[PDB]
Amino acid sequence: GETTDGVYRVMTRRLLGSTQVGVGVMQEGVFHTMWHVTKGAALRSGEGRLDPYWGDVKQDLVSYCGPWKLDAAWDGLSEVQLLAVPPGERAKNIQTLPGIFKTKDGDIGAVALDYPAGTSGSPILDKCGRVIGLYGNGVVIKNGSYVSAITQGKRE
């Protein structure tokens, strides 16, 4: 199948027509997405198969063909871009200054951008084009607005 680096839509034919359930990143031969997009199922890429390699429900992340490769982190000061890939629509870059999720185990960057559930797994990048996390696991705040964590894995 297609192994070229880049952003990909994750599709299913199980429901009506062809439905986009999420998005992921191909980097260094490994496919990276959020756990809630695939639930750990195998994926097809053309005539090839991608098998899960690592995953964790609590982090809400999963990697295919190899270990998690993304290790860039938000610097805590600069604006970033969500490379949003919405269902049936072209990939588009959106610049924003992240907010913060403060937790008992430390602080996490967060992006206050509202896209359909099928955009889950879209990458958040720094000014060097490095993926600092994936968009799509977050919360609904007081005014009904959506805020996603910048979710990043660990490179072993």
Partner 1 sequence: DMYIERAGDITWEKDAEVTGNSPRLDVALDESGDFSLVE
Q: Pick the catalytic residue from 5, 18, 32, 36.
A: 36
List residues near ligand A1AJY by CB under 6 A: 115, 117, 119-120, 135-136, 146
Please report how close the Cβ of residue 94 comes to ligand A1AJY at its closest, in angstroms.
12
Query: In angstroms, what is the minimal distance from the CB of 19 to ligand A1AJY?
Result: 15
| Catalytic annotation present for 120 | yes
Q: Which of 28, 73, 88, 97 binds partner 1 (CB under 8 A)?
A: 97
Give the shortest CB-67-to-partner 1 separation in angstroms. 19
Q: How far apart are CA 105 and CA 102, in angstroms?
A: 8
User: Please, which residues have CB within 8 angstroms of residue 12's CB and are 6 or more apart in sequence?
Assistant: 18, 19, 21
Cα separation values, 83 from 5, 29, 88, 156, Å: 14, 20, 15, 25
Whose CA is closest to 45, among 28, 67, 24, 71?
A: 24
Closest CB 68 distance from partner 1, rounded Å: 16
DSSP-derived pairing of the beta strands 52-56 and 30-33? unpaired
Nearest of 145, 148, 61 to residue 109 by alpha carbon: 148
Structure tokens at 61: 């992340």
Provide the 3-class DSSP secondary structure of residue 118.
helix
- How many residues touch partner 1 under the rule CB under 8 A: the total is 68
Catalytic, out of 32, 60, 122, 148: 60
Which residues contact partner 1 (rule: CB under 8 A)? Answer: 1-2, 4-14, 21, 23-25, 27, 31, 35-36, 38, 41-45, 50, 57-60, 79, 81, 83, 85, 91-105, 110-113, 123, 125-129, 131, 137-139, 141, 147, 149
Question: Which residues are tagged catalytic?
Answer: 36, 60, 120
